[PDB]
Design brief:
The structure is a homodimer of 262-residue chains.
Chain A lengths: L1 E7 L11 H16 L5 E5 L4 E2 L4 E4 L3 E6 L9 E3 L2 H13 L4 E6 L8 E5 H8 L6 E5 L6 H17 L4 E6 L16 H15 L11 H7 L4 H13 L2 E9 L6 E8 L1
Parallel strand pairs in A: 1-10, 2-9, 2-10, 4-7, 5-8
Antiparallel strand pairs in A: 1-12, 4-9, 5-6, 11-12
The structure holds zinc ion (5 copies).
């Protein structure tokens, strides 16, 4: 049963807000944590773990272990893979002809069956009560249609499970908001970010696939691909927006949003 | 140019020999290091990193970072990927219809482009002069034919490269050589190890694909799959055995072997 979806950022400021917009953002993330505290498991889609051009990753390793923070911000901790659910996701994707790989590491069981986590996962996880997880990774060379279809099949698996599951979508938006930022300034970053927030807030996420590659290439978001998977899941489980917040304290846009069962 | 091939173990005793057989093994491993000291890059096939059922992995991440030693033996260190060579291997496998994935992590380049190393890589690397590496991973659910073809295609890439390249195959053999080991004692471990050393020493590795599933299942080696890839490379680049050694100090077979161009 898919009882909620949380769109969560993976920027360090979310953990240490320095302005009122980022504080409101953190408030939403804390509310996501509260909303999902009675989940049995989480499914987490992250763009900053393993990245394959043309296959969606399903991590099978037993132990998910903090490894790589952003800009030296270490968030130590260990989570456990929900192996049964991970296998269900992988098998459903295989059956639906969605390109996917089953990712084990070192050993297939025991303490050596482990997989590294990065800030892409660790920052959202700071706000959530510890539960077993399935870590999934998007693939940027898959078509919009394939990503949406992957989300639909994912939603089927999560909804059909006897477990109460929350879907966590880790995503930051345009990365060129400041001339002094690492990607410099591009006006398209704000265009993308404002569009995403309108789609979220006005419950118009069905328009996500219509965003042209041109805007995406220029805006430099990380969010688009996993948000298409999210849209697919929303096709199978009616949800409603509870709240949302956007903040851009430095050079990149961050959003938090909570949807619950309608 | 494929300059040579080194079969190397990934057991802790190889780094700290406590008997004559293991000392002889370490000598061969040191000879491999010496023989390949003038190489430009290494290609390393390991069974204890990422493991996908049905796709060969090509690690693209820029920085290869020690993460997971075996049984407390940490071997800290950092290596760099030969990204140009890694791309050549991936592209050639794709072209030849060898199932393969391009494995990036966190970021496509720069500081966060990092991939974890385990004892499967770190132990052989202790014997080699530091050079850029391409890390590859076998897949145990691919057919013998596909694994051999993958090695043939790999051999062609390494041979056609302007660089002087050594292929390193990380491999331990049967794992049931001691009643007190994690798998107890099984005569099939001896049978498999004896056969592998026979095929190496008599230069009859062409017989590798004839080893029955039952023997492999009972002997519990990790070596078989990557040795089939190795065989494929030998198909394309004629090599000759220089030296070999076997040791089984604890519960698992280890071999070192050096082949150079015929
Ligand atoms: Zn990001
Ligand atoms: Zn409007
Ligand atoms: Zn595939
Ligand atoms: Zn091993
Ligand atoms: Zn014989």
């Amino acid at each position: 049963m898919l009882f909620g979806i949380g769109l969560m950022p993976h920027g360090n400021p979310a953990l240490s807000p320095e302005d009122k917009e980022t504080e409101k953002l953190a408030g939403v993330l804390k509310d996501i944590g509260k909303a999902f505290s009675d989940a049995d498991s989480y499914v987490l889609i992250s763009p900053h773990n393993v990245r394959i051009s043309d296959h969606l990753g399903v991590i099978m390793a037993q132990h998910l272990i903090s490894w790589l923070g952003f800009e030296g911000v270490e968030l130590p901790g260990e989570w456990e893979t929900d192996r049964g659910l991970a296998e269900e996701v992988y098998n459903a994707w295989k059956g639906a002809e969605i390109p996917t790989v089953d990712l084990h590491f070192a050993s297939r069981s025991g303490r050596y069956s482990r997989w590294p986590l990065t800030w892409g996962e660790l920052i959202p996880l700071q706000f959530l009560e510890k539960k077993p997880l399935v870590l999934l990774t998007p693939a940027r060379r898959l078509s919009r249609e394939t990503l949406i279809k992957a989300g639909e099949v994912l939603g089927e698996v999560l909804e059909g499970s006897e477990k109460k599951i929350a879907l966590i979508v880790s995503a930051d938006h345009g990365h060129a908001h400041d001339e002094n930022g690492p990607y410099g300034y591009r006006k398209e970053s704000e265009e993308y970010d404002r569009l995403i927030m309108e789609l979220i807030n006005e419950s118009r996420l069905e328009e996500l696939p219509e965003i042209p590659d041109e805007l995406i290439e220029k805006a430099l978001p990380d969010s688009y691909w996993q948000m298409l998977i999210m849209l697919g899941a929303m096709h199978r489980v009616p949800v409603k927006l509870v709240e949302s917040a956007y903040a851009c304290p430095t050079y990149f846009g961050m959003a938090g949003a909570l949807w619950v069962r309608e």
